[PDB]
Structure 1
Amino acid sequence: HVKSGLQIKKNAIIDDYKVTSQVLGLGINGKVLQIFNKRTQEKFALKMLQDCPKARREVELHWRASQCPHIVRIVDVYENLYAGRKCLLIVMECLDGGELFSRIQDRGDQAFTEREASEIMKSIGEAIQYLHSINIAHRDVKPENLLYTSKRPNAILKLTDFGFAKETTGEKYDKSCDMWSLGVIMYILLCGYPPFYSPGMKTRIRMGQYEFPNPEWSEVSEEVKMLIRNLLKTEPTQRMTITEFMNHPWIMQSTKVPQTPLHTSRVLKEDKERWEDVKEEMTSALATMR
């Protein structure tokens, strides 16, 4: 099938949208502000990039990805002058449900189940699949870039941030780090801490120890552990691919996976002072796996 290419608008964005000062996110590449379409009054998000080759690649690759139901949608892209600099202003659908793990952490029940984790991974998996099959690797799949459409329990999860995406034609192992990200996310979903070796807090993984500590992992099947191990495999030549992953019975039959109660929500609350550290370890790790 054939799709339309990206048409960058040159008219001033203020002809079309009201632009507020409320920041809805921060990025080592620019900011995200709140805005409203003038004629319809619909709310939208605005990502601002200083125009450059990298910004252009971000917008292009994200444009290709945009129609995926589990990737955030680009409504329009503008090339404008702002504050004395030439910018790409990107209008996206509003995603005000919060980040993936904040939600889980906030569950007053502390009632999160293996099945729920499966369905979430199928969602993320679908984004990665859409991308990998058009030879794009995202390369920044991590907690802060996964957001929900609304606060509704039934909100859709969306992958954001194409700042590190690249075309992978002829360098297939670029896709691998997206798979490791899936492994890491799945592991945190299942227990509340990442599979990282790393005062007034429990140590969840001892340095060098077996990866699935009994307190939190005792009721998780060996099949699931094997799935994680395949995703986390050290060697990119041996790591699971997105096709193998989306063909796995635990993902393919997500809705019929056991509702094993998990420690995830309680651990996220217990360890909340360490979350920034978690995100920072993952970011540093990503920089070396890309």
Structure 2
Amino acid sequence: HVKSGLQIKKNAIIDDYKVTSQVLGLGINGKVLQIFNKRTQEKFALKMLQDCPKARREVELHWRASQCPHIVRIVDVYENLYAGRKCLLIVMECLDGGELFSRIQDRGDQAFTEREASEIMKSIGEAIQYLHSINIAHRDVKPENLLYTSKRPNAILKLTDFGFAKETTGEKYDKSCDMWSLGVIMYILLCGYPPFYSPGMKTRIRMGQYEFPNPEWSEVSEEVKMLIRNLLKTEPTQRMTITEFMNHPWIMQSTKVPQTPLHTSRVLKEDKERWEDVKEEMTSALATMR
């Protein structure tokens, strides 16, 4: 199993691409821009990082993970001077489809089923598995980092952003972080709100209460709940591993999971004014778990 190493280009990227000023993101450590291949017109995205030890680590680890069908692909990396500062410029496959939960929030029908949730979870679990197998922990798995290739309902989900990723030899438990994220995302996919604690809106979870409230959880099986409790286990020493997760009947036979109708889409709309807080709660939480 032998892969090629990263070969950073030094020529000006503007020899190869038309670079616009429209900012497709204010990501973890750079900004993402819209660009076009000069000779093919084909669309791509560009991540700019000021060159430095962290930026070199993100790029390297992202390069190792690139060929995974559920991680955003790296096309090339340039080292250039950009507006007076030294940069790593990363050209990436273009990810048009929007973020994971915007798509679901926007479903016309409010017709999201448990089986769809399963299939999505399988996609994210494959990315984590690719990484964990080569001893990388992503450590930033969360909503804004999960994007679809295009707007086609047949679009592929891709994990992005290696700004917190690290190598994990000697340090197994660094991976638990990613598992906890799977649990949170799974939980949100099933009901439309995070399993978190805390004005004009419904309170989804009272402080300290049983974690699966009846209105939204009553038709979800105990089996699925056990799987969630395993992913959310407080102690990293007891939390489910990516191997156990990918061997679970609910993930393994995702396409034979019941099509139970879910509240998710409807809850995401009603609670939309709270989304940013949900993302913020998750981001802070991650800062203390990684």
Please give the range of the TM-score, normalised by the shorter of the 2 chains. Answer: over 0.9
Post-superposition offset of 1:22? 1.1
Paired residues, number:
290
For residues 193-220 of structure 1, the C-alpha deviation after alignment (integer angstroms, 9 at most, x for no partner) is: 0000121100000000000000000000
Identify the residue that residue 130 of structure 1 maps to in structure 2.
130
Post-superposition offset of 1:30? 1.4
Question: What SS does structure 1 have at the residue aligned with 2:278?
Answer: helix
For residues 61-116 of structure 1, the C-alpha deviation after alignment (integer angstroms, 9 at most, x for no partner) is: 00000000000000000000011000000000000100000000000100100000
Within the alignment, does 1:165 sit opposite 2:165 as a pair? yes
What is the distance in 2 between the residues matched to 1:150 and 1:38?
21
Post-superposition offset of 1:182? 0.1
For residues 203-239 of structure 1, the C-alpha deviation after alignment (integer angstroms, 9 at most, x for no partner) is: 0000000000000000000000000000000000000
What is the distance in 2 between the residues matched to 1:167 and 1:233?
23
What is the distance in 2 between the residues matched to 1:260 and 1:27?
35
Identify the residue that residue 38 of structure 2 maps to in structure 1.
38
Post-superposition offset of 1:56? 0.1
What is the distance in 1 between the residues matched to 2:18 and 2:142?
31
For residues 139-172 of structure 1, the C-alpha deviation after alignment (integer angstroms, 9 at most, x for no partner) is: 0000000000000001000000000000001100
The 8 Å contact of residues 138 and 165 in structure 2, kept in 1 or not, is answered as yes
For residues 244-276 of structure 1, the C-alpha deviation after alignment (integer angstroms, 9 at most, x for no partner) is: 000000000000000000000000000000000
Identify the residue that residue 96 of structure 2 maps to in structure 1.
96
Post-superposition offset of 1:285? 0.1
What is the distance in 1 between the residues matched to 2:8 and 2:88?
9
Identify the residue that residue 51 of structure 2 maps to in structure 1.
51
Percent sequence identity is 100
What is the distance in 2 between the residues matched to 1:157 and 1:27?
18
Post-superposition offset of 1:28? 4.1
TM superposition outliers: structure 1 runs of 4+ over 3 Å: none
What is the distance in 2 between the residues matched to 1:120 and 1:48?
29
What is the distance in 1 between the residues matched to 2:46 and 2:147?
15
Question: What SS does structure 1 have at the residue aligned with 2:48?
Answer: strand
The 8 Å contact of residues 72 and 158 in structure 2, kept in 1 or not, is answered as yes
After superposition, the CA RMSD in angstroms is: 0.4
Question: What SS does structure 1 have at the residue aligned with 2:46?
Answer: strand
What is the distance in 1 between the residues matched to 2:181 and 2:198?
17
Post-superposition offset of 1:27? 2.0
For residues 110-130 of structure 1, the C-alpha deviation after alignment (integer angstroms, 9 at most, x for no partner) is: 010000000000000000000
Gapped runs of 5+ residues in structure 2?
none
What is the distance in 2 between the residues matched to 1:28 and 1:10?
24
What is the distance in 2 between the residues matched to 1:23 and 1:62?
21
What is the distance in 1 between the residues matched to 2:87 and 2:137?
25
For residues 165-201 of structure 1, the C-alpha deviation after alignment (integer angstroms, 9 at most, x for no partner) is: 0000110000001000000000000000000012110
What is the distance in 2 between the residues matched to 1:114 and 1:154?
18
Post-superposition offset of 1:29? 1.3
Identify the residue that residue 219 of structure 1 maps to in structure 2.
219
Question: What SS does structure 2 have at the residue aligned with 1:27?
Answer: coil
Question: What SS does structure 1 have at the residue aligned with 2:235?
Answer: coil
The 8 Å contact of residues 137 and 165 in structure 2, kept in 1 or not, is answered as yes
Question: What SS does structure 2 have at the residue aligned with 1:155?
Answer: coil
The 8 Å contact of residues 28 and 161 in structure 2, kept in 1 or not, is answered as no
Which stretch shows the higher mean deviation, 75-84 or 22-31? Answer: 22-31
What is the distance in 2 between the residues matched to 1:153 and 1:216?
25
What is the distance in 1 between the residues matched to 2:107 and 2:40?
34
